[PDB]
Design a protein around this motif. Structure first.
Motif, PDB file in Angstrom:
ATOM      1  N   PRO A 281       8.618   9.136  -2.386  1.00 21.78           N
ATOM      2  CA  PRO A 281       7.413   9.385  -1.248  1.00 21.78           C
ATOM      3  C   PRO A 281       6.576   7.505  -2.820  1.00 21.78           C
ATOM      4  CG  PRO A 281       8.322  11.188  -1.266  1.00 21.78           C
ATOM      5  CD  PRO A 281       9.067  11.008  -2.763  1.00 21.78           C
ATOM      6  N   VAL A 282       6.097   7.737  -3.644  1.00 20.02           N
ATOM      7  CA  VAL A 282       5.440   7.384  -4.556  1.00 20.02           C
ATOM      8  C   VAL A 282       5.820   6.112  -4.214  1.00 20.02           C
ATOM      9  CG1 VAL A 282       4.471   7.022  -7.011  1.00 20.02           C
ATOM     10  CG2 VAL A 282       5.155   9.432  -6.315  1.00 20.02           C
ATOM     11  N   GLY A 283       7.267   5.915  -5.466  1.00 24.48           N
ATOM     12  CA  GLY A 283       7.450   4.201  -5.115  1.00 24.48           C
ATOM     13  C   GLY A 283       7.481   3.939  -3.634  1.00 24.48           C
ATOM     14  N   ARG A 284       7.658   4.394  -2.628  1.00 27.43           N
ATOM     15  CA  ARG A 284       7.880   4.471  -0.767  1.00 27.43           C
ATOM     16  C   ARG A 284       6.338   3.891  -0.602  1.00 27.43           C
ATOM     17  NH1 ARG A 284      11.407   0.713   1.997  1.00 27.43           N
ATOM     18  NH2 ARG A 284      12.449   2.098   0.283  1.00 27.43           N
TER      19      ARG A 284
ATOM     20  N   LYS B 147       5.979  -7.286   3.967  1.00 26.07           N
ATOM     21  CA  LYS B 147       7.309  -6.352   4.010  1.00 26.07           C
ATOM     22  C   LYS B 147       7.525  -5.459   2.725  1.00 26.07           C
ATOM     23  CE  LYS B 147       7.396  -3.216   6.703  1.00 26.07           C
ATOM     24  NZ  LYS B 147       7.380  -1.964   7.359  1.00 26.07           N
ATOM     25  N   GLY B 148       7.548  -4.495   2.081  1.00 28.42           N
ATOM     26  CA  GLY B 148       8.208  -4.081   1.189  1.00 28.42           C
ATOM     27  C   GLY B 148       8.906  -3.544   1.272  1.00 28.42           C
ATOM     28  N   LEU B 149      10.783  -3.899   1.113  1.00 26.10           N
ATOM     29  CA  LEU B 149      11.775  -2.858   1.835  1.00 26.10           C
ATOM     30  C   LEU B 149      12.218  -2.382   0.578  1.00 26.10           C
ATOM     31  CD1 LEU B 149      13.535  -5.917   3.707  1.00 26.10           C
ATOM     32  CD2 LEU B 149      12.772  -4.391   4.347  1.00 26.10           C
ATOM     33  N   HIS B 150      12.642  -2.068  -0.635  1.00 25.45           N
ATOM     34  CA  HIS B 150      13.716  -1.745  -1.693  1.00 25.45           C
ATOM     35  C   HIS B 150      12.908  -1.877  -2.603  1.00 25.45           C
ATOM     36  CE1 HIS B 150      16.777   1.555  -2.495  1.00 25.45           C
ATOM     37  NE2 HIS B 150      15.674   2.295  -1.731  1.00 25.45           N
ATOM     38  N   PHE B 151      13.201  -1.192  -3.992  1.00 21.88           N
ATOM     39  CA  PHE B 151      13.415  -1.924  -5.186  1.00 21.88           C
ATOM     40  C   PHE B 151      14.156  -1.778  -5.328  1.00 21.88           C
ATOM     41  CE2 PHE B 151       9.263   0.671  -5.434  1.00 21.88           C
ATOM     42  CZ  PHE B 151       8.924  -0.424  -5.647  1.00 21.88           C
TER      43      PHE B 151
END
Ligand SMILES: CC(C)(CO)[C@@H](O)C(=O)[O-]
Length: 303
Positions: free
Chosen positions: A99-102, A114-118
């Motif tokens: 949840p923190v990175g998300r 839009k951030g999709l992933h690391f």
């Protein structure tokens, strides 16, 4: 097919290139050829920073870029590149995917992404042309190239180097001696032949560097929900696939670089490195509320 333009700043065989290829493949497969990803790579479109502006404008739809470069766009991202935040990938993965990175990926919307992933870049290690490095004292004075990121410039100022922010690539500067060193994961040092212009390597592992996989927010949200889901699904699987691909190759990179003649310090003074970076959490940057709370949330999650 609808063509989707995706940019990376690096070349075939590089970490974010491989992630993008895998994504483009999966997307083509799962979308029954309704989408076709058009990769733009190497220095075609400028630095990672130029890339981001193009994605922000909508002239490019998607990109995978080193996360540190995003802190000019969204200050809270800087906390991700705080030194010794992560010291293993198991922790990193859980925290970044959790949840923190998300929540940090979600807040890229504030800058129109839009951030999709690391995805993985890697543990960054220090290299230079001037002397071996064991302790922070050893870096005093060195003209170390850093990315165009606030946290990285301050980090290396705090350790006593003379850092210079600069877009990729950097090889000419290194060879011309205008810069003494730089820092990056092992794949970068090898794949871009930095050993040719750098005598020394220390395994400081000072920052765990990710890539951010992102899209233009307006373009992404105008897609039907099932396609928004489809794209996230592919990028998530691509990032997971690439983490494994890259981590399988790390060992070979080290040996390759050894065989190539680099002088490697495998266990520099890490406790003294940590102590010397301690004042960074009171940096101009890190005094900002949003940034500090993001750092705190990240650190809490590692425990
Ligand atoms: C080499 C790089 C572009 C890989 O993402 C980045 O780590 C950088 O600029 O140091």
């Amino acid at each position: 097919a609808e063509d989707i333009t995706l940019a990376v700043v690096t070349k075939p065989g590089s970490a974010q290139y491989v992630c993008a290829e895998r994504f483009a493949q999966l997307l083509a497969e799962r979308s029954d050829k309704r989408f076709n990803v058009v990769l733009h790579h190497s220095a075609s479109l400028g630095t990672e920073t130029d890339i981001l502006q193009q994605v922000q404008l909508g002239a490019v739809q998607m990109a995978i870029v080193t996360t540190g470069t995003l802190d000019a766009f969204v200050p809270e991202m800087a906390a991700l590149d705080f030194p010794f935040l992560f010291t293993d990938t198991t922790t990193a993965d859980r925290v970044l995917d959790g949840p923190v990175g998300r929540g940090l990926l979600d807040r890229l919307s504030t800058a129109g992404f839009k951030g999709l992933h690391f995805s993985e870049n890697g543990f960054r290690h220090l290299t230079n042309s001037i002397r071996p490095v064991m302790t922070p004292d050893d870096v005093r004075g060195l003209k170390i190239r850093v990315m165009e990121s606030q946290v990285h410039r301050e980090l290396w100022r705090t350790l006593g180097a003379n850092p210079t922010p600069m877009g990729w690539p950097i090889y000419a500067e290194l060879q011309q001696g205008t810069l003494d060193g730089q820092e990056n994961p092992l794949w970068v040092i090898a794949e871009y032949r930095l050993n040719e212009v750098q005598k020394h390597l220390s395994l400081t592992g000072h920052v765990y560097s990710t890539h951010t996989d992102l899209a233009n927010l307006a373009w992404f949200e105008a897609l039907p929900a099932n396609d928004r889901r489809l794209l996230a699904s592919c990028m998530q699987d691509a990032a997971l696939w690439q983490r494994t691909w890259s981590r399988q190759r790390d060992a070979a990179y080290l040996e390759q670089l050894r065989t190539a003649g680099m002088q490697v310090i495998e266990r520099p003074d890490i406790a003294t490195f940590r102590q010397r970076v301690q004042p960074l959490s009171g940096s101009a940057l890190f005094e900002h509320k949003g940034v500090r709370k993001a750092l705190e949330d990240l650190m809490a999650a590692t425990r």
